[PDB]
Amino acid sequence: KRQVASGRAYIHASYNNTIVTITDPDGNPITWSSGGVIGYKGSRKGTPYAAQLAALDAAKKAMAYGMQSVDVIVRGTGAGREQAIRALQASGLQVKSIVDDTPVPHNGCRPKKKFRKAS
Amino acid sequence: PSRKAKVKATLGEFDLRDYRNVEVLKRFLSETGKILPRRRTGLSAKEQRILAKTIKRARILGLLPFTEKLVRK
Amino acid sequence: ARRRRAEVRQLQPDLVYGDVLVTAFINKIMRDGKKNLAARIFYDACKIIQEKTGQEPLKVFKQAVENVKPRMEVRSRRVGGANYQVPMEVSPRRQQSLALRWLVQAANQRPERRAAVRIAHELMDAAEGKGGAVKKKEDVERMAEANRAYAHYRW
RNA sequence: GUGGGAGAGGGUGGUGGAAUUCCCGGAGUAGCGGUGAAAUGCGCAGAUACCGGGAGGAACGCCGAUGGCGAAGGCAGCCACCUGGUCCACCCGUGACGCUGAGGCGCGAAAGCGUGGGGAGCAAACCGGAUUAGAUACCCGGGUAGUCCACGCCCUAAACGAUGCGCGCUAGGUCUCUGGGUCUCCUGGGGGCCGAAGCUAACGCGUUAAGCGCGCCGCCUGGGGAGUACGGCCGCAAGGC
Ligand SMILES: [K+]
Ligand SMILES: [K+]
Ligand SMILES: [K+]
Ligand SMILES: [Mg+2]
Ligand SMILES: [Mg+2]
Ligand SMILES: [Mg+2]
Ligand SMILES: [Mg+2]
Ligand SMILES: [Mg+2]
Ligand SMILES: [Mg+2]
Ligand SMILES: [Mg+2]
Ligand SMILES: [Mg+2]
Ligand SMILES: [Mg+2]
Ligand SMILES: [Mg+2]
Ligand SMILES: [Mg+2]
Ligand SMILES: [Mg+2]
Ligand SMILES: [Mg+2]
Ligand SMILES: [Mg+2]
Ligand SMILES: [Mg+2]
Ligand SMILES: [Mg+2]
Ligand SMILES: [Mg+2]
Ligand SMILES: [Mg+2]
Ligand SMILES: [Mg+2]
Ligand SMILES: [Mg+2]
Ligand SMILES: [Mg+2]
Ligand SMILES: [Mg+2]
Ligand SMILES: [Mg+2]
Ligand SMILES: [Mg+2]
Ligand SMILES: [Mg+2]
Ligand SMILES: [Mg+2]
Ligand SMILES: [Mg+2]
Ligand SMILES: [Mg+2]
Ligand SMILES: [Mg+2]
Ligand SMILES: [Mg+2]
Ligand SMILES: [Mg+2]
Ligand SMILES: [Mg+2]
Ligand SMILES: [Mg+2]
Ligand SMILES: [Mg+2]
Ligand SMILES: [Mg+2]
Ligand SMILES: [Mg+2]
Ligand SMILES: [Mg+2]
Ligand SMILES: [Mg+2]
Ligand SMILES: [Mg+2]
Ligand SMILES: [Mg+2]
Ligand SMILES: [Mg+2]
Ligand SMILES: [Mg+2]
Ligand SMILES: [Mg+2]
Ligand SMILES: [Mg+2]
Ligand SMILES: [Mg+2]
Ligand SMILES: [Mg+2]
Ligand SMILES: [Mg+2]
Q1: Contact check, Cβ <8 Å, A100/B70
Q2: How many structural domains does chain A have?
């Protein structure tokens, strides 16, 4: 119960799960959701439909705090990013700006064998 | 094929070694803080090579960005 | 059908109501190539529709067929070595085919004595929104849309 | 010699931002992670996701390329200092001072060894979870030496253009890097592609020769046994010649 009425929406989309964190304009979170907060347990979380459900659930939780407009921030390349985008877009929440802010290094650390053949 | 406009052709007389001229080096960066390739800038090999180091200097001085964020995705 | 597209067969219209849909339902009723027996069954079922309902049996028939048509089904697909139940829409021809097949099959599951009574009761119950055929439609539209998580495997 | 030029060539010191991890605080709640699917794992001692601050180690995104430099290995943020090679123009100086090179000497990726330090990420060995007929594997969660630094060893490789060095001669076209010039183009040095003559068993090579010649060094003489044995030399050892 804070009545923020305007904040940010971070989307963390990986190939294994999509998780949505709704925060205030300073970044402090309010509510959140993910594929695991919905009934989906295993690989079904890395599904665009699961991402849609997570986005809609986080949006409905933010409705309790009476929030209307959000600023969307996307991080990570994963199946279900655009589906969460389109879920938040038409959810009653006014989407003011969508921004991709995926953290890309300047070739700092050595990846795992899974991500090798690169630097 | 980058048929919109060349940065050099959309510009006049300028110094390629001036790391303090921010408003002219801003044109040579993309929407992100990244340095534009040759197909976008329309510079020569030597020109682009000098531009790279001058942009890096302008970045270290705090004038140009190392990286920006993408909007309207 | 690999080379061609296998154009649909055009059925002859009905001798009574002039509807090709009635003829298709006759054919799904037909057994061992006994057309006259199937026509007897269906037209006696129509005579059962009246004197049990003031509405013409053609309207009840078409409304039941419309109530049985499914909107989405679920087909299997082999992806990544596993087999998934992918939901997808249904073309109108397959809607009609499944509707008539389910109508006949559910009618013959009834405990009624003779065939005309089975078909008539199934048509009436499906028109008013119940029976085994509507149960099949609900089960298919439950399996589909119960696996919404595979909608991106539509193909 | 003079005057210019390009360069991740090398060494030393300093310095910047992104990211990973960890610590502190805020906010916040039931999972995160991971896979074909899972489980170990981590999470109510509050994780993941988000914001801010701090520490540390390592590597430099875009530029960036089929590019550049170096004898090879190899070299990629930025700044300064020290320093090597090289190219062009002038036609100035010396006057055959040249080429090659058995030995010798020095350099020599990675891994490995010694002493000290460092240790974020990764990760042999190893500890587990899966898979499997079994799985001393691939897949997943951890993880030590190591990877990093200083100094000293080690001398190996698909150390590759699988092509020793130098010089001269023998059609061109095209792309490119870098100079000079009467700057459509010409001329010189380097990096590619296609091709004259010619060569090759063929594939292919073809002014960057695998063509035509000359000089000098290295090496080959059927396969296995075998880069093994013995001997010698070198090395702390692994081991190398
Ligand atoms: K090269
Ligand atoms: K130690
Ligand atoms: K020129
Ligand atoms: Mg998952
Ligand atoms: Mg049935
Ligand atoms: Mg250098
Ligand atoms: Mg905390
Ligand atoms: Mg973990
Ligand atoms: Mg752990
Ligand atoms: Mg536990
Ligand atoms: Mg508690
Ligand atoms: Mg974390
Ligand atoms: Mg932080
Ligand atoms: Mg530490
Ligand atoms: Mg690149
Ligand atoms: Mg070179
Ligand atoms: Mg090499
Ligand atoms: Mg003279
Ligand atoms: Mg003289
Ligand atoms: Mg020599
Ligand atoms: Mg020698
Ligand atoms: Mg060595
Ligand atoms: Mg080493
Ligand atoms: Mg050591
Ligand atoms: Mg040590
Ligand atoms: Mg690890
Ligand atoms: Mg591992
Ligand atoms: Mg194991
Ligand atoms: Mg087996
Ligand atoms: Mg077993
Ligand atoms: Mg540790
Ligand atoms: Mg040791
Ligand atoms: Mg090679
Ligand atoms: Mg060789
Ligand atoms: Mg050979
Ligand atoms: Mg040669
Ligand atoms: Mg040339
Ligand atoms: Mg050729
Ligand atoms: Mg010929
Ligand atoms: Mg030929
Ligand atoms: Mg030659
Ligand atoms: Mg032999
Ligand atoms: Mg022999
Ligand atoms: Mg042998
Ligand atoms: Mg050996
Ligand atoms: Mg040996
Ligand atoms: Mg011996
Ligand atoms: Mg000894
Ligand atoms: Mg050994
Ligand atoms: Mg051994």
Answers
A1: yes
A2: 1
Among chain A residues, CA nearest to B66 = A106
C152–A48 C-beta distance less than 8 A: yes
| Among B56, B63, B20, CA closest to B48 | B56
Quote the domain boundaries for residue B19: 1-73
Structural method? X-ray
One-letter amino acid identity for C134? V
- CATH of residue A59: 3.30.420.80
Q: What are phi and psi of C30, to 5 degrees?
A: -55, 145
Chains contacting chain A through 3 or more C-beta pairs under 8 A: B, C
Q: For residues B63 and B23, what is the distance between their CA atoms, to the nearest angstrom?
A: 10
Of all residues in chain C, the one with the smallest CA distance to A80 is C152
Decide: CB of A39 under 7 A of nucleic strand D: no
CB A7 within 8 A of CB A70: yes
How many whole angstroms separate alpha carbon C48 and alpha carbon C117?
7
In chain C, the domains with their CATH numbers are: 1-155 (1.10.455.10)
The whole-angstrom separation of Cα C88 and Cα C155 is: 9
Matching residue, tokens 């080096």: B25
